[PDB]
């Protein structure tokens, strides 16, 4: 027993004896010393007064002092000692009570560990407090107005955000945000929006948006608005900025997302602002890198096949896709940009449909020069070439918005042509040209096609895919009304056709990512008969929660996956597997849980259940060639079930789409030898090689940009269109409708990091490119890149790598160094 410890053990009696005297003259010196006695051990975080822990039973003698008379100074310091003692035990409605009723001085005077205990109990009783207890939160709000400043003072800021989150009072955080800590709060809160459910999704997003707006950080404020899909806020965010240089860089992010904004002529620099967001200069900027990265030379499919190292209509059609995929958005090719009539007519039947359409994929984003080359094939007498070119119209404007549209002129008068093929190149092309536009003129021109009597199920589904792509994520009731109207008018027998599966997809795309906006639509779908109703409601429900991560929604999908049918009844089972990928794709943590579940579905699932797992792998990790998935897809490449075999090979190329993976290309080359005697399997093999070398390693199909936090509705629409169509790879892809692979054009974007000057000319500078590192939590300055290398700016960033400027000579407008970025010269540099 230490004498100093015994000295405090004495105060359990003599100091209480001083507080046991009737006169108040001895009360204050004992209590004031007792109040300071706690602070004596509070100066050390680990040291606590153990004799004080023996004073807990002594509160009975002190019960009357802090309760039974005036609260001036007798109860003031008497209760606070109990509050510190209330820190040790459970402290249910005690630790807060003595602090609330006792001394109301500065909160940090009793210790950081005490308030941390106190702050936690503040949220605990807040949930307990009901509506009638609003007259109990008056001192509760006072503490949080002082707890929050204390937490940010000692860099314990992530604890502060936690206090307001539990009590649902994150509104008052912004008033106390300072210049030195704005970046930490928003980065912390934004990381939380992917796991908190509704309605706190928007609330945390708006509150994080408020901090950015107050601190004049517009470019990152616009990112939060886009994540919120608040078109009015996007208007308000854009026009509030008076720095046109920031506005020019902002227009790039809108163009990258595909969100168009109709500015007023009164806004300064109106011309260049519309050009930047319309991506009209994307073709020239993309060609500028190609000259800089000395990869402009065309690549024949033979250079991709590499058959000289290896120890038909389908073959010719396969190489048409490989030629288009490899030379996509380049404008030059040794096989079709030359005299391609020998090659174009080498294909047969619908092989010429995709071959003619593949010509526009080399000319992707080149609306002016691309339309200059298609015109030769537009007057072809053979029906496939013209409509294949008609679809090649939609590809050439895909991803670009023209002030007056060329594509509609070339495609308006062929949506109601008597020949079904000519329409087939019209609506599908028209969809790709204006995917993510919600424009009424095209939709009104495209709408009556679906209800046309001569419109076959093939074009009717194509119409649903197109109008769903134009109005993706818009909840346009006009497109919604007809999609239901066509669906229940159709007879039960023709609903067996797999081209009717595209109708719910068009409905689902129209409500892509909206969430709770489908119950009215789901109400209409009960009337539709089974098993299509099982298919239809699953497709739209999945599309409603796309990129949301809702664990509740994926709970029901596996419940569909739990009951296995001994095909016709289990048609909807494939979308359920595809559903897990579409919802969990939003953030990394949700996504790689899905791979573990995807393993069991490939193991315990039925053939139809396991025929969709590879597509889910492709959706969950498109253009992200991780080894775990690629090894997973490799094992089922040579599957006994033919559909799983084709689907896995396509997913392997889809997973490494545009990554130019040397290891993955070797597997496909080995797969080409193994599947050389299988025409069906070998067609997927060639397809994957083209996708692997998509755009010669300069194009991505990933729907997520802005550091994988902002989701592109257009890209998923093309992603969903191909992958849902791959549920019937035998009849759609391997059949006569392989043109649906051109839906991937809507998702084709460059993996770009181009630094432009304030006048928008190219500005090459040294940059560091490396794997992204999560920097939530740890204070100070943590590195956001690991295993990085230094390159000039015109470099391609594959999935998961960030970019930081190596030097400080230039100040980027956006913290996200992706896409087109404007650099401003640093005044501090060269001081």
């Amino acid at each position: 027993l230490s004498e100093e410890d015994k000295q405090l053990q004495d105060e359990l009696e003599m100091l209480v004896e001083r507080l046991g005297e009737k006169d108040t003259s001895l009360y204050r010196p004992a209590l004031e010393e007792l109040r300071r006695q706690i602070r004596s051990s509070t100066t050390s975080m680990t040291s606590v007064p153990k004799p004080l822990k023996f004073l807990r039973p002594h509160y009975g003698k002190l019960k009357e002092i802090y309760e039974n008379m005036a609260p001036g100074e007798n109860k003031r310091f008497a209760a606070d000692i109990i509050s510190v003692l209330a820190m040790t035990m459970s402290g249910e409605r005690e630790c807060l009570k003595y602090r609330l009723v006792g001394s109301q001085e500065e909160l940090a005077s009793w210790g950081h560990e005490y308030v941390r205990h106190l702050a936690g109990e503040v949220a605990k009783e807040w949930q307990e407090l009901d509506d009638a207890e609003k007259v109990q939160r008056e001192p509760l709000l006072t503490l949080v107005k002082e707890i929050v400043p204390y937490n940010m003072a000692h860099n314990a800021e992530h604890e502060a955000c936690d206090l307001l989150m539990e009590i649902e009072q994150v509104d008052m955080l912004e008033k106390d945000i300072d210049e030195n800590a704005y970046a930490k709060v928003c980065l912390y809160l934004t990381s939380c929006v992917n796991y908190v459910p509704e309605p706190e999704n928007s609330a945390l997003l708006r509150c994080a948006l408020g901090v950015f707006r107050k601190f004049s950080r517009f470019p990152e404020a616009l990112r939060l608005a886009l994540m919120l899909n608040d078109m009015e806020l996007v208007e308000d965010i854009f026009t509030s900025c008076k720095d046109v240089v920031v506005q020019k860089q902002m227009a790039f992010m809108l163009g990258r997302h595909g969100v168009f904004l109709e500015l007023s002529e009164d806004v300064e620099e109106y011309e260049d602002l519309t050009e930047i967001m319309s991506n009209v200069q994307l073709n020239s900027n993309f060609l500028a890198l190609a000259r800089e990265l000395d990869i402009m030379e065309p690549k024949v499919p033979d250079d991709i096949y590499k058959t000289h190292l290896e120890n038909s209509a389908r073959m010719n059609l396969a190489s048409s896709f490989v030629n288009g995929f490899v030379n996509a958005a380049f404008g030059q090719d040794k096989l079709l940009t030359d005299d391609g009539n020998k090659w174009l007519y080498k294909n047969k039947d619908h092989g010429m449909l995709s071959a003619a359409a593949s010509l526009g994929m080399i000319l992707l984003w080149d609306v002016d020069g691309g339309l200059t080359q298609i015109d030769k094939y537009l007057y072809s007498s053979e029906d496939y070439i013209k409509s294949g070119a008609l679809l090649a119209c939609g590809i050439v404007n895909s991803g670009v918005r023209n002030e007056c549209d060329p594509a509609l002129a070339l495609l308006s008068d062929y949506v109601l042509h008597n020949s079904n093929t000519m329409r087939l190149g019209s609506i599908f092309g028209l969809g790709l040209a204006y995917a993510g536009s919600n424009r009424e003129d095209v939709l009104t021109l495209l709408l009556p096609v679906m209800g046309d009597s001569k419109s076959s199920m093939e074009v009717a589904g194509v119409t649903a895919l197109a109008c769903g792509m134009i109005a993706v994520g818009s909840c346009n009731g006009d497109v919604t009304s007809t999609i239901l109207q066509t669906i229940m008018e159709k007879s039960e027998t023709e609903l067996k056709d797999t081209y009717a599966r595209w109708l719910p997809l068009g409905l689902g795309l129209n409500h892509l990512g909206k969430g709770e906006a489908i119950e009215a639509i789901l109400a209409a779908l009960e009337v539709v008969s089974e098993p299509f109703r099982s298919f239809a409601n699953t497709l739209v429900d999945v599309c409603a929660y796309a990129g949301s991560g809702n664990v509740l929604k994926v709970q029901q999908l596996l419940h569909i996956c739990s009951e296995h049918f001994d095909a016709d009844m289990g048609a909807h089972q494939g979308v359920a597997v595809l559903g897990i990928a579409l919802i969990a794709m939003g953030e990394e943590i949700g996504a790689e849980m899905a791979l573990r579940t995807f393993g069991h579905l490939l193991r315990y699932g039925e053939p139809t259940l396991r025929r969709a797992v590879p597509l889910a792998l492709a959706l969950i990790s498109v253009s992200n060639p991780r080894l775990n998935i690629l090894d997973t897809l490799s094992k089922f490449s040579h599957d006994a079930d033919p559909e799983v075999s084709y689907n896995s090979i396509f997913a392997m190329g889809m997973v490494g789409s545009g990554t130019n993976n040397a290891r993955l290309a070797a597997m496909l080359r080995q797969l080409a030898q193994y599947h050389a005697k299988d025409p069906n399997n070998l067609f997927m093999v060639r397809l994957a090689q083209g996708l692997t070398h998509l755009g010669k390693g300069t194009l991505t199909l990933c729907p997520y940009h802005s550091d994988r936090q902002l989701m592109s509705q257009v890209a998923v629409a093309g992603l969903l269109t191909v992958l849902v169509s791959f549920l019937d790879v035998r009849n759609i892809i391997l059949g006569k409708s392989h043109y649906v692979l051109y839906g991937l054009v809507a998702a084709m974007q460059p993996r770009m990091l181009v630094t432009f000057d304030e006048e928008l000319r190219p500005l090459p500078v040294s940059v560091r490119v490396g794997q992204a590192v999560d920097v939530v939590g740890q204070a100070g300055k943590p590195k956001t890149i690991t295993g990085f290398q230094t390159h000039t700016t015109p470099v391609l960033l594959a999935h998961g790598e960030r970019a930081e400027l190596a030097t400080e000579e230039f100040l980027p407008v956006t913290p996200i160094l992706e896409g087109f970025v404007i650099l401003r010269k640093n005044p501090n540099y060269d001081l």
Partner: protein, 395 residues
């Protein structure tokens, strides 16, 4: 800390869940080489264990009465026995040739499947399966050397059409020689990264073996396995281990190793055509190589990796100081001038040591003084151990 209690509750529930998940899922253990249960096709394995019968590996020796309709095959079943058997009904008579390995049954020993020729597992591992992380952009000061190396070992495989049309037979061998650290293996590593044909890496010390005739045997199986591919590359790093010139010192001095070189010489240019193999030899002692090995038809191109010049040394400095957090005004041209005859390896160490002086000083950016101190420490202080002065005489 207010969530410390709630963290451990969900962490323990999670850890209990994986342990619970692994109970039903399985995959526990692996010491007997068991694959995860998701890959268990036990229905097919039971059929495989019955429908597919095991086959003993045997070598065909002589075909008796091949012309007639009753061709008898004499087989050598390794260490078991020798049998005169006939072909199975599911294999063509023309698919089995004398001297080739076959698969035979355990009942009547009839040949059931032709088999690949036996190849030493050590030789099989000598082929490169993961390409190195070195590109030609990582080699500085070797411009002319690199074009000569590519146009023999890379261009003919990539674009063979430009050689057959003009009746051109491209050289099938390159010797890279130079002092240590000049970039001989670095350029070879760049070749393997870019090449799409099969790349085999051979180290001369790997061809030295305990018993008599092994090194020649391994060379024979090396080229035998290389010939089973349309295009192949064999890299012989440190060929001087076995490529030394033949001599007679009374006793059997290096007689066994010379036979290994003679076999390698025979495969490169002998009675039989080599094939589509393009060999690549690297050595720092080319003066010791045998004259017959240093002859065109075996080593057609002699690319010399001399010490880089001022322009080359500046290029190497930029390559290695690309990712450094250097200052703005680092005079790399001055640094190249401070090390007149220095290998590229020394320049890399200068770059590494330059950042080491700054890391020692707790500085995040390396100044020009650090590079100046690095040159003194590497080029000057470590000049006692420099291999350049002795090895320029050998090259």
């Amino acid at each position: 800390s207010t969530y410390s209690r709630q963290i451990k509750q969900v962490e323990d529930d999670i850890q209990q869940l994986l342990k619970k998940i692994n109970e039903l899922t399985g995959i526990k253990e692996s010491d007997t080489g068991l694959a995860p249960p998701a890959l268990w096709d036990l229905a097919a394995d039971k059929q495989t264990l019955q429908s597919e019968q095991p086959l003993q590996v045997a070598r065909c020796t002589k075909i008796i009465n091949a012309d007639s309709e009753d061709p008898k095959y004499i087989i050598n079943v390794k260490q078991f026995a020798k049998f005169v058997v006939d072909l199975s009904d599911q294999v063509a008579p023309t698919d089995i040739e004398e001297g080739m390995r076959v698969g035979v049954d355990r009942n009547k020993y009839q040949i059931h499947i032709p088999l690949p020729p036996k190849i030493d597992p050590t030789v099989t591992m000598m082929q490169v399966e993961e390409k190195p992380d070195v590109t030609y952009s990582d080699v500085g000061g070797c411009k002319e050397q690199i074009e000569k190396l590519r146009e023999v070992v890379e261009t003919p495989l990539l674009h063979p059409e430009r050689f057959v049309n003009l009746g051109i037979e491209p050289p099938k061998g390159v010797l890279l020689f130079g002092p240590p650290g000049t970039g001989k293996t670095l350029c070879a590593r760049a070749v393997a990264n870019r090449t799409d044909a099969c790349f085999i890496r051979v180290i001369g010390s790997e061809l030295v073996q305990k018993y008599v005739g092994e090194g020649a045997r391994m060379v024979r199986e090396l080229f035998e396995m290389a010939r089973t591919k349309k295009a192949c590359l064999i890299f012989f790093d440190e060929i001087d281990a076995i490529g030394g010139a033949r001599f007679d010192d009374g006793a059997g001095g290096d007689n066994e190793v010379q036979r290994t070189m003679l076999e390698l010489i025979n495969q490169l240019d002998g009675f039989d055509p080599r094939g589509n193999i393009k060999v690549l030899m690297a050595t720092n002692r080319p003066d010791t190589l045998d004259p017959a090995l240093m002859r065109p038809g075996r080593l057609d191109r002699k690319i010399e990796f001399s010490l880089p010049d001022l322009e080359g040394r500046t290029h190497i400095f930029k390559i290695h100081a690309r990712s450094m957090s250097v200052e703005r005004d680092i005079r790399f041209e001055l640094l190249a001038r401070l090390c007149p005859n220095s290998t590229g390896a020394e320049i890399r160490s200068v770059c590494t040591e330059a950042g080491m002086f700054a890391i020692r000083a707790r500085r995040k950016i390396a100044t020009e003084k650090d590079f100046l101190e690095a040159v003194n420490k590497v080029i000057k202080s470590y000049a006692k151990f420099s291999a350049t002065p002795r090895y320029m005489t050998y090259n």
